[PDB]
């Protein structure tokens, strides 16, 4: 979203100009996810995938800023979680193939506790944390019973 | 001839300047927010 000088001379009128990328619809197969995605894409993205030698490599290599796509970061989280868990759901009944894939993408593996939070927006992370730490309050009956039993045990011992 | 432009009707009043219509759009929500910031007793009509 910028502006240009008509006829590319600064002494001419200044005009609002929007340059848009040429978008294509393409189907990509993810080895780690064993799924085909139809994704609106740019020729730049196709070239980057070629340089990375595959969609999975492109997703796992490109950082958040360069990827600049919530879908891309969700794919990254899915692939990273798959690698961290070594999920047998990757090509079930084909453990050799699953091991081959995981070995191919071994260098990107990270702890699952970290792969869970990859690519999450701040609000999504906040919701995840709230869900993790939400607990229906324990009735004070249980707490007071535990305390009373503990105190009675101490008194009996003493 | 002029002066009596206000022909009161509670239906039009509420449908045009009410709380629900004010909240119906971001511009109206900002109207309410400005009234709240100014401290108006009557935020909506």
């Amino acid at each position: 979203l910028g502006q240009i000088y008509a006829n590319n001379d600064k002494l001419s009128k200044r005009l609002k100009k929007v340059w848009k990328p040429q978008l294509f619809e393409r189907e990509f197969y993810s080895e780690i996810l064993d799924k085909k995605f139809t994704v609106t894409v740019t020729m730049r993205t196709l070239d980057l995938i070629d340089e990375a030698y595959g969609l999975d490599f492109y997703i796992l290599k490109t950082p958040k800023e360069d990827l600049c796509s919530k879908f891309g970061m969700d794919l990254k989280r899915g692939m990273l979680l798959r690698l961290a868990r070594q999920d047998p759901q990757l090509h079930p009944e084909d453990p050799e193939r699953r091991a081959a894939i995981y070995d191919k993408y071994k260098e990107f593996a990270i702890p699952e506790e970290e792969a869970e939070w990859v690519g999450l927006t701040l609000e999504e992370a906040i919701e995840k944390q709230r869900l993790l730490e939400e607990k229906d309050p324990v009735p004070l009956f249980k707490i007071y019973v535990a305390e009373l039993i503990q105190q009675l045990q101490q008194q009996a011992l003493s | 001839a002029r002066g009596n432009e206000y022909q009161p009707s509670n239906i039009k009043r509420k449908n045009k300047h009410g709380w629900v219509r004010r909240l119906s759009t971001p511009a109206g929500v900002q109207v309410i927010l400005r009234r709240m910031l100014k401290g108006r007793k009557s935020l909506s009509h």
Binding site: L33, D34, K35, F37, K70, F71, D74, L75, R77, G78, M79, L81, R82, R85, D87, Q89, L120, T121, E123, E124, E127, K128, R130, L131, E134 | -
Partner: protein, 392 residues
Amino acid sequence: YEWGVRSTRKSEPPPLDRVYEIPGLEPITFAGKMHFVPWLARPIFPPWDRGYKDPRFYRSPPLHEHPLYKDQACYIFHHRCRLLEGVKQALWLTKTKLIEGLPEKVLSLVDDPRNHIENQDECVLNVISHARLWQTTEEIPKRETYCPVIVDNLIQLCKSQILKHPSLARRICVQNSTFSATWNRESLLLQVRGSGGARLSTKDPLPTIASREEIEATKNHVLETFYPISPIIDLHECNIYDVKNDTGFQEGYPYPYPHTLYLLDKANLRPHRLQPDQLRAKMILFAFGSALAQARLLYGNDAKVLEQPVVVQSVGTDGRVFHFLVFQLNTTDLDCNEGVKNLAWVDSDQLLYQHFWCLPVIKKRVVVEPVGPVGFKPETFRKFLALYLHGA
């Protein structure tokens, strides 16, 4: 060309979040928040079941699962069906032969002046005047008001003949009676669910009008057919129906034999009023339905020529014009087009009066037509009284 424009069709749901397409991860939705937020994934909510069951919030499970749903489609005729071909279609459906004019057996019951009501014309004129002008504080009563009034007042006027005819004590005019009758016609199963109103019940069955010879002579008569209109047109084609024959009353009811079906077309609006031909068709069908329910109750549910034909009368009126019908059901073997055929005598478009002036028309301050009925025809009332007195 498809009816219903897209902009009016229900909007397509928004596309699912791409997060739901990634096998390994559990999307973070606002379901936990218990409210929508635009920056979280939209939950996929399980269908809710505890609703759509409570009364006042019911759903009526699909038609296929209803107890009476049947693959074979019946064609019902209810009070609000208007036959395209009218009398011809009714005759074909009921396997009936038409006879213009009422039978002499009934028409003779009023020839002798003893049956004639004392001050008959005076009383009938008063009844018409009350129905059409004096009924209400309003200057011009509507049809919805003056049709039932005229019918009921005429019925009372006829009932006043209890003096001469003590047999009139063995009858009663019931209201809101509803009968049901099912029968086959060339592999098509037809039903009539007659609701109408003002069914005249008698403790004794009506005498038959047609003799054995005439009933047999109906065999030669060929049932008029009409093409490309099928006889089913304008009949409610329905898969949820009951084949039971209902006479409209519990067993043991006094006055079990139908005598007259009083059908009134009291709708204020002409489009909501039956045409005369369609009203006659409805009369034929309802008389046939009552007679068939009676026959199925008496001689069992067997398709056969009736040894004792069942006679049912019907008067169908719009408050001014009347139609008189006497239907003799003499066969329950309706499936075939051949054999003895039921037979109906119809007297059509018997207008009691041709116009009523509710206000006095004045031209140049001169009264041209005085207030009241004009063109009153006592012949129609004689026919009405004859039908009422039949069987007594």
